[PDB]
Ligand binder design. Structure first.
Ligand SMILES: N[C@@H](Cc1ccc(O)c(O)c1)C(=O)O
Ligand SMILES: N[C@@H](Cc1ccc(O)c(O)c1)C(=O)O
Ligand SMILES: [Fe+2]
Ligand SMILES: [Fe+2]
Lengths: 148, 147
């Protein structure tokens, strides 16, 4: 492989809320935290106050907070990395992911940008299962099972 | 616990993004689709075509909505801000930055932004970083880890 996926950066308005939900939902760990930033970072992300690297298996997530004066909601009609898909290992885990999202949502431990619950688990004609949820920032995560 | 499968790129000009993703990343198209379930159309209203591109271990699902105009990314918004890919050698960092400038200067692709690539910077541990924008204005980072 010429290159390998390293990590994805998640911008949030409430770092504490995202750090708790990501660790609870995905089983993430905190590898390191950063509060000093170079001239290029403050130019790219004006107002960044802290960045934390999260690790859940092969997926690494760099969650960072910027202004937090307002709490805007994601825009849909705009070009974007629209969603992040994660492959499960059995059809049973698909129900597990949807159940655990609901459990964390109605537990009251977190504030969600949007109140939209998880989608149903949908089968296509080739046996693929599809499940979509929103993180605490209103960003879409897809859980799938490919009969590979 | 799980395996990262693919990222979804929402674009307004699919053929423009397809051509750039193929030349820049060396992407090859795995499959495509133009008939969608109710769930897909509810999530992405007006979706027309969906294509899975593969380059390395990374799968990229580029899809186009109702084109209409050509909107630009919004920065103040909670979002997946950037995608980082790891290189195998320090000289590849300059190879990536050069291939971006070549593809941009060729005039063969439409860009939402005029912003060129950043300089290659070094951190306290020797990690090299490089930030470029795709034809949709979305930020990609190339990194090199000495350890
Ligand atoms: N290395 C950057 C901050 C940073 C760290 C990890 C990652 C990223 O995108 C940016 C700085 O020293 O200011
Ligand atoms: N299975 C979806 C299309 C699709 C495939 C893979 C992925 C995704 O987000 C959407 C359908 O029939 O509409
Ligand atoms: Fe998807
Ligand atoms: Fe990064």
């Amino acid at each position: 492989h010429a290159f390998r996926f390293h990590h994805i950066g998640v911008q949030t308005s409430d770092l504490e809320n995202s750090l708790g939900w990501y660790r609870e939902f995905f089983g993430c760990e905190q590898n390191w935290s950063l509060e000093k930033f170079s001239d290029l970072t403050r130019s790219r992300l004006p107002g960044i106050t802290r960045l934390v690297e999260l690790a859940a298996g092969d997926l690494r997530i760099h969650v960072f907070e910027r202004a937090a004066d307002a709490t805007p909601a994601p825009v849909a009609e705009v070009p974007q990395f629209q969603h992040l898909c994660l492959a499960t290992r059995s059809p049973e885990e698909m129900t597990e992911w949807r159940d655990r999202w609901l459990e964390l949502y109605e537990s009251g431990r977190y504030t969600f940008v949007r109140d939209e619950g998880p989608t149903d688990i949908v089968v296509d004609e080739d046996g693929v299962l599809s499940l979509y949820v929103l993180d605490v920032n209103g960003l879409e995560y897809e859980f799938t099972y490919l009969p590979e």
